[PDB]
C-alpha cells in the first residue's frame, strides 16, 4: 500500500546526526573495534524513513527504518557497506525483513563525500603513546648502566666496560618496539630510537672510578631530541 511516516524529531540516546540528512544517524552504541586491527571501526548507520517499505511476507507490514552495517578503515578512509537490514520500528529495531544479498562495496571518503566529516569524528573517537614510547627508550639503558657501574668498581676503569665483557650484557642490535639498538663501549651506552622515535638518540657516558667518583653524562642527538623528558639531556 502507501503509508506516510512522521520520523522522530528528537534524537534517541546513543544516536547522533553528523550529515545533512537529519534522519540519518550514526549508532554510537553499536561502535566496536578489535584491538588487533585498531584502525578498523565497525558501526551501524540508521535511517528513519518518511514512507513505509513493504518488504515482509505479510503484505500489510512495512519497514519504518533501515540499519546499514559499515566498516571504516581509518588508515585509508575506505568505507565498506557490509549489510542492509529493514526494521518495522524506528531506530533500526523490531522485526527484521528477510535477508537479501549485499553487493559488498568499498569507497574512498575524500573531502567532498557526504560521510567525510562523520568519518573524521568516528576515527577521532575510535580509530586511534608518545611519552610512554620515550619512557621505554629511557628504560632501555637501565640494565646496561647498572652493569657498567659494577664493571667500574670491579676493574677500576671505564676502558673495557663494553658489551659482552665484564658482566655487561651483549649489545642489542635487533630493533624491538621503539628501541632500534643499545650498544656499550668503554663506558658509553648508545641508545637509538626506532619507528616514531627514529630521530632520537642518547649516549650515557661513565667517567672516573671509585676514588674520583663515578660520574655520568647524558648527551642527546637527533632532530626530535626535544621529545626527551625535562632535565634528561645534559
Author numbering: 8 to 135, 145 to 250
Which passages does the manuscript contain on this structure?
The construct produced in this study was a fusion protein composed of a large part of the PE sequence, a hinge of two glycines, and a large part of the PilA sequence. The crystal structure of the PE-PilA fusion protein showed that most of the protein was visible, except for three small disordered regions comprising the first seven N-terminal residues (in the PE domain), the linker region (residues 136 to 143), and the C-terminal His tag. PE-PilA also crystallized in space group C2 and had two molecules in the asymmetric unit with a noncrystallographic symmetry dimer interface (area, ∼450 Å2) via the PE domain of the fusion protein C terminus. Interestingly, crystal packing analysis revealed a crystallographic 2-fold PE domain dimer, very similar to the one observed in the isolated PE crystal form, with a comparable dimerization interface area (∼870 Å2). It is unclear whether this crystallographic dimer represents the biological dimer, but it probably represents a favored interface in the crystallization process. The PE and PilA entities of the PE-PilA crystal structure have tertiary structures that closely match the isolated PE crystal structure and PilA homology model, respectively. In addition, two disulfide bridges in the PilA domain of the fusion protein that corroborate the mass spectrometry data were revealed; one (Cys167-Cys177) links the N-terminal α-helix to the intervening loop of the first β-strand, and the other (Cys236-Cys249) links the final β-strand to the C-terminal loop. Only the N-terminal hydrophobic α-helix tail was missing in our tethered PilA, but this tail provides both an anchor for the globular head and a hydrophobic surface for the assembly of pilin subunits to form a pilus and as such seems less accessible to antibodies than the globular head and, thus, less immunologically relevant. We observed a more substantial crystallographic symmetry dimer interface (∼870 Å2) in PE-PilA via the PE domain and one of ∼890 Å2 for the isolated PE (excluding the C-terminal His tag). Interestingly, our PE dimers were generated at pH 4 to 4.5, close to the side chain pKa of the key interacting residues Asp52 and Glu54, while the published structure was obtained at pH 6.0.
